[PDB]
Each structure stands twice: as structure tokens, then as C-alpha cells.
């Protein structure tokens, strides 16, 4: 069960769920198929992305989730803007629980605790910690009757092994072929964020879920991926918080539509090119939501994201 | 992940493979290992969870103590100790135990004193094909202690119904697969079967899945003569077990503190079901052990043979 990149775990995992189900039911009344214990290795977690064009995958979404978790935020504006049906998990209109990773991670309800910060420094001391744990999940999510958004992910783990830093995610249940899209997406860009704060290269990822499944709403949508290769960018080195934080800055600008940037402009900006690129993500989606002119924007993104554009959004970028 | 019938087959793989294939030799906290990230496998057979190869000197007393030290609630040392007299050096004011006693991770996580193992019944209960049966052990404040000499190596344990078959996963962010993988997965399948006789079910698959799995360099020797070198475990009865447990903790802590003995006839009157009244029999010659009382026929043969085994000179 080892794999070079992330579409290839996907694609087979995909696959084996559909043609080979351990079950087939209906937990909290949605039928599905689905395998239990279900894991995989990727060698090379920095090629993240899905580029298969029937499954049209949002890497606009994919950054504006993991930004959304190194934010710390619960806030549900800030989300729903770039996937509208997740207001269904909330359950107030405004914050979100067990979607919101951003706090379980820097600051964990269980005690306010900065998991993150505990994690940078047990392996400053220890290098070859095995107690380098991100805990996700909460004891008192399953203590309240009906609760809307409980928490998929158990932990993530980080460990050094010959200068390389390795992630695990740990879930409980796992959406094969919607949610693994976005989750291997988050937890392999914070593990990349932790190894260039740490000054280490990228190990290896692995992922692991009691139950991985396929809604049965969503067969004929994962028979045509399965019907149906410029590489993803690395995140520079060193400490990428200053970046992230002025990233975060045009987010909440362009998101509100109180600013726009030209393609001068954005390579203007005090960032190196590939955090531009992200913030430009955002500038064509801003174009998207407000419905502005489409934009030459597109020509100084790398491939993928060229490529991603083009099929989520094509009367804009196609 | 690999899929096995018995624990024994799933220990012996495994640790064939970290042994002679590990993936990496390093030295967390300063103890020199070999190593393999990203491990586990799958019981078919999970209630013979036991291991009877004669030189692992496998301890079912042990066994046994610890997973009904879970079911008690109890973080106490003085239990624990008495079976494990190792296990004291986890503890840092010499009465509790902290990341290593998973009772009260259990029954009163310390996030919010949460009763999980009933949240896990209410939940499966009421919705049979949950995703959320999950007993969570981990908790974010572990890293926060100072020097923390006792951190839990298990993240959670998760319970499914799938196809009337009570299944389990346990997760873990480390596991010596030499050592504590013997006890661990005893208690977690031990775990259950409890669960499965309290819902009246039977009993599924156990999944072990685990982010380090390494055995100690200074365990290699012993390792090597396990790997160098059949009685079924018995079923506990269905139905509700609570009130036997009630009854099987009062007679540990009597014999552990030695208020009390029992003799074959004394052990045949308790009011336990037989395989309950074996447990209290194993308590009993723990305690002619360590209380160096004079020396087992009414035993199944697991139980006699890990006697005989780790006790020759009383019970060989």
C-alpha cells in the first residue's frame, strides 16, 4: 500500500472501495460502501494535488482550508465562502466544531493548549520523539446528543527519521472519494510547513481510517474518475508564519471584495513567488464570487494551479 | 497491515520483521531502537489474543490484572505494581500513573470527566452502523507536563457493528512490538469482547494500527530466542459482565494485599461464573508467589501453561 503521490493512493483506494466493499449500509441513514482500517503510504507528500479532470478538484478550496486551520480560526465565514455546503455543519451560523481543526491544533479546547508549539519543541529537544502528537478529536463531542460536526480526525503524529519529516493522519471515518481530497491536502501542507520550519525535508506520509467509504450519491460521479503531469510547487524554506500571515491579510481583502489585484500588483507584493501564487489563487476567485472580469493573472501560475482553474471554473479560465 | 487469525501469528510476523527488517535504528529519549513507521494487522480470532511460545515467559496474571485495572477506573500504582513492579518506574509521585493508566482515560477522560464507554454504548445503541464509537485515550495537555516521564502511547480505541460482529481498532501512536504489544492488545481485544457480550454480540475483526513500532536494543537478545523457538483462550460469557468484574475486583485487591486466601474448594464456591472464578484463581497463585504462601487443576490449559512457564518452581 505504498504510493509515489497522493492521485495514486486515491485513484486505487477509489477503486478497491467501489468494485470491492467489505459493506455496504447506512450510518446516520446515508448508504454507502465502505472498508474498514483502511491506510496508505505516500513516498512524495509535497505532489498533494488531484489533476484528474472529471473529479475537478478546487485547489483554491484545498489552500483556503489548510489557511484556514494555520489561522486558528472556528469561523465560518471565512469557509463557507470557498464551499458554501458547509454551512450545513454548523449548527449557530457562524462557527464550526469538529470541522474547525484551526483551534484543535493551536489552541485544543481540552486545556487552550498550542499543540503545534508543543510539536516544534518536543522535536527541537528530541529529534527522534515518538510523542510528537497533534490530538484532533474531543471526549466530549460524542457527549452531546445530535451533534452535527464531530470530529473525523483523531491526531496527526510527526516524527524525524534521516533528516526527513515524516506525517501521519490518523481518522476515524474518511469520505474516499470528497473528503480524502481535501484532508491528505491540509495534512500534507502542515506537514511541509512544520519540515521547513524545522529546516528538514519532507519524509514520508502516511494515513490510516477505521472507515473509509463512498456514498452511494456519489457513485456515478467516482465511475467517471475512475473512467478518465506538471508537478505541485514546494513551499519555501525557513519559517513560513510572516508569509502566511500577509497571505491571510489579502485573503480577508479579496474574500470581501474591498480590494483586487492586478497581475501587476500581485507580483508586486512582499512575498516569495510561491505564496503569490496562492494569494493569486484567491484574486481569481474573488473574480469568480464578485463576478469580475477574468483575468494574464493565469499566465504566472504554475501548471497545476493553471490546470486546476481551467477545469473547476472553465467559462472563466478555460 | 496484514491479516492474521490469533494474536500469536500477528506478534510473530511482526516481530520477525522489525527484528531482522527494520526501517530505522535510532534513540528516542536516549534508548536505542529498531524501528518500522506506519505498522499493524488484523485479527480474524481476536479472543485468542494470548501468547504461549514458552520463552516470551508470557504472564496472563499480568494480563489479566491490567485489563480489569482499566475497567476499575483506577490510576492507582500500588495495584499495578503488584504484577508489574517495572511499571513504578512511570510513576512521578509514586502513587498514580498517568499516560499508562488507561482506566480513567476510559470512564472519566480528563477532558471534561466524560464517561466514554458509555458514550460509545449509548452511541452504537442507538445507531448500530456508527463511525463514531470512539473511546478517545490521548489528550493535548500530556506534552504540556514538564518532563513528563508517562505520555499514553494510545490515541483511541474505536468500536463498529458490522454485520452483528462487534469490531475494534486500536491506534497508537507507538507500540514496543516485543514488549507492550503482548498486554496492549490483550487489553484491547479483552476490551472487546467485554463490550461485545454487553451488547449481545459477537465478536469481529481487531485492527492494530500503529505509528512507531519498534523493539529496544536492549530487548534484542530475548527477542531473538522468541523468534529462534494448540490450547484455545477461553470466551467470556455473554451478557452483562459488570457485576462479575464487581466481584472479581474484590477478591484481586484481598489476595493482592493478602486479607484473605482462597483454597481449590474455596475457589469452586464462589458465586462467578467458572471462567470468572479462573481469574480469581490466578490471583490466588499470584499471590502463594509473591506472598511466599505454599502452592490450578480447574484451570484451562493457557492458563496452566503460562504458570508453569513464568512460575516453574511453583507451578512447572
Not at 99 to 126: C, M, S
Not at 222 to 245: C, K
Amino acid at each position: 500500500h505504498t504510493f509515489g503521490t497522493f492521485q495514486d493512493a486515491y485513484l486505487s483506494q477509489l477503486r478497491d472501495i467501489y468494485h470491492s466493499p467489505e459493506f455496504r449500509n447506512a450510518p446516520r441513514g446515508q448508504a454507502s460502501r465502505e472498508r474498514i482500517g483502511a491506510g496508505f503510504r505516500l513516498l512524495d507528500p509535497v505532489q498533494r494535488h488531484i489533476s484528474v479532470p472529471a473529479r475537478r478538484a478546487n485547489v483554491v478550496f484545498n489552500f483556503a482550508e489548510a489557511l484556514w486551520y494555520l489561522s486558528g480560526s472556528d469561523r465560518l465565514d471565512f469557509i463557507q465562502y470557498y464551499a458554501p455546503g458547509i454551512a450545513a455543519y454548523s449548527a449557530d451560523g457562524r462557527t464550526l466544531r469538529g470541522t474547525a481543526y484551526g483551534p484543535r491544533i493551536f489552541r485544543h479546547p481540552a486545556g487552550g493548549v498550542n499543540q503545534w508549539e508543543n510539536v516544534v519543541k518536543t522535536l527541537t529537544d528530541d529529534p527522534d520523539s515518538k510523542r510528537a502528537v497533534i490530538q484532533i478529536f474531543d471526549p466530549r463531542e460524542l457527549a452531546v446528543a445530535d451533534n452535527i460536526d464531530v470530529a473525523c480526525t483523531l491526531a496527526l503524529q510527526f516524527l524525524i527519521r534521516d533528516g526527513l519529516l515524516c506525517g501521519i493522519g490518523y481518522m476515524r471515518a474518511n469520505d474516499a472519494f470528497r473528503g480524502a481530497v481535501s484532508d491528505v491536502f491540509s495534512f500534507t501542507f502542515l506537514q511541509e510547513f512544520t519540515a521547513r520550519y524545522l529546516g528538514l525535508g519532507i519524509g514520508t506520509y502516511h494515513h490510516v481510517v477505521g472507515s473509509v467509504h463512498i456514498y452511494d450519491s456519489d457513485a456515478r460521479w467516482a465511475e467517471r474518475v475512475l473512467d478518465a503531469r506538471p508537478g505541485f510547487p514546494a513551499m519555501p524554506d525557513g519559517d513560513n508564519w510572516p508569509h502566511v500571515r500577509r497571505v491571510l491579510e489579502w485573503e480577508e481583502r479579496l474574500r470581501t471584495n474591498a480590494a483586487r489585484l492586478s497581475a501587476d500588483a500581485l507580483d508586486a507584493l512582499d512575498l516569495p513567488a510561491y505564496w503569490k501564487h496562492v494569494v493569486a489563487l484567491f484574486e481569481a476567485h474573488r473574480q469568480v464570487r464578485h463576478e469580475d472580469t477574468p483575468d494574464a493573472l493565469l499566465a504566472a501560475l504554475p501548471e497545476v494551479y493553471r490546470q486546476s482553474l481551467a477545469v473547476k471554473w472553465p467559462g472563466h479560465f478555460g
